[PDB]
Design an enzyme around this catalytic site. Structure first.
Site, short mmCIF file in Angstrom:
data_model
loop_
_atom_site.label_atom_id
_atom_site.label_comp_id
_atom_site.label_asym_id
_atom_site.label_seq_id
_atom_site.Cartn_x
_atom_site.Cartn_y
_atom_site.Cartn_z
N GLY A 1 2.72 6.38 8.97
CA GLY A 1 1.40 6.03 9.48
C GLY A 1 1.37 4.67 10.14
O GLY A 1 2.14 3.77 9.78
N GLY B 1 -0.81 1.18 10.98
CA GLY B 1 -1.78 0.35 10.27
C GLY B 1 -2.32 -0.75 11.16
O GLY B 1 -1.81 -0.98 12.26
N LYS B 2 -3.36 -1.43 10.68
CA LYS B 2 -3.97 -2.53 11.42
C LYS B 2 -3.09 -3.78 11.38
O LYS B 2 -3.24 -4.66 12.22
CB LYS B 2 -5.36 -2.85 10.88
N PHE B 3 -2.18 -3.83 10.41
CA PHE B 3 -1.34 -5.00 10.19
C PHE B 3 0.16 -4.67 10.14
O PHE B 3 1.01 -5.58 10.13
CB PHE B 3 -1.80 -5.75 8.93
N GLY B 4 0.46 -3.38 10.13
CA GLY B 4 1.84 -2.89 10.16
C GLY B 4 1.98 -1.44 9.73
O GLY B 4 1.10 -0.89 9.07
N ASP C 1 -13.71 1.63 -4.26
CA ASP C 1 -13.66 2.36 -3.00
C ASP C 1 -12.99 3.72 -3.16
O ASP C 1 -12.12 4.08 -2.37
CB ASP C 1 -12.97 1.52 -1.91
C1 LIG Z 1 2.20 4.84 1.61
C2 LIG Z 1 2.67 6.28 1.40
C3 LIG Z 1 2.35 7.32 2.17
C4 LIG Z 1 2.99 8.34 1.59
N1 LIG Z 1 3.00 9.63 1.96
C5 LIG Z 1 2.66 10.10 3.17
C6 LIG Z 1 3.06 11.37 3.56
C7 LIG Z 1 2.69 11.84 4.82
N2 LIG Z 1 3.08 13.14 5.25
C8 LIG Z 1 2.84 13.59 6.64
C9 LIG Z 1 2.09 14.93 6.60
N3 LIG Z 1 2.79 15.89 5.73
C10 LIG Z 1 2.04 17.16 5.71
C11 LIG Z 1 2.93 15.41 4.34
C12 LIG Z 1 3.73 14.10 4.31
N4 LIG Z 1 1.95 11.05 5.62
C13 LIG Z 1 1.56 9.83 5.23
S1 LIG Z 1 0.59 8.81 6.30
C14 LIG Z 1 0.10 7.51 5.21
C15 LIG Z 1 0.37 6.16 5.47
C16 LIG Z 1 -0.04 5.17 4.57
C17 LIG Z 1 -0.74 5.52 3.41
N5 LIG Z 1 -1.17 4.68 2.45
C18 LIG Z 1 -1.17 3.35 2.41
O1 LIG Z 1 -0.77 2.60 3.31
C19 LIG Z 1 -1.73 2.80 1.09
C20 LIG Z 1 -1.06 1.53 0.56
C21 LIG Z 1 -2.47 1.46 1.16
C22 LIG Z 1 -1.00 6.87 3.16
C23 LIG Z 1 -0.59 7.85 4.05
N6 LIG Z 1 1.92 9.36 4.02
N7 LIG Z 1 3.65 7.89 0.52
N8 LIG Z 1 3.46 6.67 0.41
#
Ligand SMILES: Cc1cc(Nc2cc(N3CCN(C)CC3)nc(Sc3ccc(NC(=O)C4CC4)cc3)n2)[nH]n1
Lengths: 43, 271
Positions: free
Chosen positions: B14, B16-19, B130
């Site tokens: 994913g 982010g706004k900061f990374g 939240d």
């Molecule tokens: C951090 C984190 C994220 C994950 N898991 C996933 C997994 C994921 N996937 C893409 C879509 N398929 C269907 C499933 C796996 N997509 C994201 S996209 C995403 C990006 C960041 C965050 N969360 C954060 O940054 C939290 C810490 C504040 C959640 C989802 N995150 N595990 N740990």
């Protein structure tokens, strides 16, 4: 994307990790961390 | 201490706004995790340094199967790196959007997991503030993981004053400018349960003042398809008066939760 990070190679590794969890407290939680004060200072 | 070279970077998960967050593998244990990468200059420019420090302090000291783990963290010249548990099934909000609404089994399981995680936090005088689908991830077996602690506070003694969270999830006491306590998370849990089962939050409105009005009147209108048990639980959480809200242990013990939850605890290490 490297082989390990996609498809059933990933699925397989993820399944293995769920059923055979490592000691993350020891493996990662014991290893030194930077002081939160120092996080915006010299590395 | 760790370095970025200790990890195979797999792919971005994913923006982010900061990374960005990356799927990563720690080289020596071949252990798959997520790496959240933050830029030091961007955090400083935006003036969110103490904010980030607070989030790291809280999340890194929490250990619960339904709270996303922060294993450790490190930094280099330009970046701060957070070593996070990988949640293989991803964003809960994406799953809710995909299905429109969850069935009772799914929702009840999530509620038990949420209540357990929140009880763990409150035991430590951490208020989340939240709870909403967007802040939840899903584990290998679909287990809820509280992922984001951006509005969270350690509040050992003083009641709180900060208006925070998300419009549709705000408790009456925040809207009315009262002090608040941990019981705000009880309210948000009730809104969450409703949104799970219905697919929209209960006080949905075209304007912020109408939403505010509906919240402080607790203008709850249950759709006809909801079971008596689910309405009972939601009703017991969405109480105007914080002290009258069903305690987290009460959520775990609620008969609708008991009857419908298929909660499974993940395997633990493993002496
Ligand atoms: C951090 C984190 C994220 C994950 N898991 C996933 C997994 C994921 N996937 C893409 C879509 N398929 C269907 C499933 C796996 N997509 C994201 S996209 C995403 C990006 C960041 C965050 N969360 C954060 O940054 C939290 C810490 C504040 C959640 C989802 N995150 N595990 N740990």
């Amino acid at each position: 994307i490297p082989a390990w990070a996609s498809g059933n190679l990933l699925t397989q590794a993820i399944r293995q990790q769920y059923y055979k969890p490592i000691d993350v407290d020891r493996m990662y939680g014991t290893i030194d961390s930077p002081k939160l004060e120092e996080l915006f200072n010299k590395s | 201490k760790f370095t970025i070279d200790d990890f195979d970077i797999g792919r971005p998960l994913g923006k982010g706004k900061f990374g960005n967050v990356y799927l990563a593998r720690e080289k020596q244990n071949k252990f798959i995790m997520a790496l959240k990468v933050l830029f030091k200059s961007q955090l400083e420019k935006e003036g969110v340094e103490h904010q980030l420090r607070r989030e790291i302090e809280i999340q890194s000291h929490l250990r619960h199967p339904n709270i996303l783990r922060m294993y450790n963290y490190f930094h280099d010249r330009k970046r701060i790196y957070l070593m996070l548990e990988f949640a293989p099934r991803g964003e809960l909000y994406k799953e809710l959007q995909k299905h429109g609404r969850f069935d009772e089994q799914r929702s009840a399981t999530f509620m038990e997991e949420l209540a357990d995680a929140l009880h763990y936090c409150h035991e430590r005088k951490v208020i989340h503030r939240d709870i909403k689908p967007e802040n939840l991830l899903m584990g290998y077996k679909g287990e809820l993981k509280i992922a984001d602690f951006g509005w969270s506070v350690h509040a050992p003694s003083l009641r709180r004053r900060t208006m925070c969270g998300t419009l549709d999830y705000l408790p009456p006491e925040m809207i009315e400018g009262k002090t608040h306590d941990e019981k705000v998370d009880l309210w948000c849990a009730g809104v969450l349960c409703y949104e799970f089962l219905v697919g929209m939050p209960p006080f949905d409105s075209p304007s912020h003042t109408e939403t505010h009005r509906r919240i402080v009147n607790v203008d709850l209108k249950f759709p006809p398809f909801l079971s008596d048990g689910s309405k009972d639980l939601i009703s017991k959480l969405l109480r105007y008066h914080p002290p009258q809200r069903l305690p987290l242990k009460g959520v775990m013990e609620h008969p609708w939760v008991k009857a419908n939850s298929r909660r499974v605890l993940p395997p633990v290490y493993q002496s």
